[PDB]
C-alpha cells in the first residue's frame with residue numbers, strides 16, 4: 001500500500017522547487033496503462049547528511065498525521081536507497097490557498113475566509129496534541145482540496161517539542177520566512193505553539209488582504225522599515241520594528257474583530273498569545289454572527 005517503486009513513477013510536470021529540493025506531479029502507474037493515481041512527489045537536489053536527516057524527520061512526522069485538514073501522506077519510494085528518497089503525497093489540483101484565493105477572490109467572501117481560517121485552527125490544534133511546531137504556516141503552504149476544504153501542507157520545517165520544554169531551539173537555520181516569524185524566533189531561533197500562533201496571525205492577515213501583492217507581509221514590512229536601510233540587515237530592521245510595536249496594518253475592509261485577533265496573535269510576549277482552541281472558538285462565533 002505504502003510501497004512505491006521508481007520504475008512505476010511517471011513524470012507529468014513540475015509543481016515547485018526550493019533551493020535544495022523540488023515537487024513534481026507524477027502518475028504512479030504499476031499497470032503501465034496510464035490509469036494510475038496522480039501524486040505529488042518530493043525529492044532533494046543536494047543531498048547532504050543534514051538535509052537527509054531533516055527529510056527523514058519530515059517523512060516520520062507525515063506518517064504520524066491523519067486529519068481532514070492536513071495534506072494526506074501516501075508513502076515513500078525507497079528504490080534508490082536512503083540517499084535518494086522520494087516522498088509521496090496526495091496531489092491537490094487546486095494548489096495553494098495563496099494561489100486559489102488570488103484566482104477565485106470574486107467568489108470568496110468573508111464568511112468563506114473564516115471557514116478556511118477555522119479549518120487551519122483545527123489542523124493546528126491537532127498538531128499541538130502531537131507536540132509538533134509547524135514553523136512554516138503561510139497561505140503558500142496551505143493547500144486547497146475543494147471550495148469548502150483546505151489542508152495544512154509543507155511540513156519541511158516541522159519540529160517536535162522536547163518532552164520537557166515548550167520550545168524547540170533550531171541550532172542551525174538556513175533561509176527563513178522572516179516576515180511570518182515571531183520576534184523570539186528572529187532573535188533567539190525559538191519555536192513554539194506560540195510562534196505558530198504568531199504565524200497564524202500573519203496567515204489571517206494574508207487572507208483578509210485577498211493576496212493583494214502591494215499588501216503582502218514582505219511588501220508592508222519593507223515599506224515600514226523605510227528607505228534609509230544603511231548599516232543593518234533586513235532581519236535587524238525587522239527585529240527593531242516589532243520591538244517598537246510596529247505591526248502589519250489593518251487591511252481596508254477587514255472587520256475590526258478579525259484585526260483584533262491578529263493583533264493578539266502578535267503579542268511580543270510568548271505567554272500572552274491566544275491558544276488555537278480559543279482562536280477556533282472566536283473565529284467560528286465571528287463567522288456565525290456574519291450570517
Ligand SMILES: CCc1cc(O)c(F)cc1-c1ccc2c(-c3nc4c([nH]3)CN(C(=O)c3cnc(N5CCCCC5)cn3)CC4)[nH]nc2c1
Nearest residue numbers: 014015016040041042089090091092093095153154155156
Ligand atoms: C510533496 C511535497 C509536500 C511535502 C509536504 O510536507 C507537504 F505537507 C505537502 C507537500 C505537497 C506539496 C505540493 C502539493 C500539490 C500541488 N498541487 C498543485 C501544486 N502543488 C502547484 N500547482 C502548480 O500548478 C504549479 C506550481 N508551481 C510550479 N512551478 C513554480 C516554480 C518552478 C516552476 C514550476 C508549477 N506548477 C498547482 C497544483 N499537491 N499536493 C501537494 C503536496
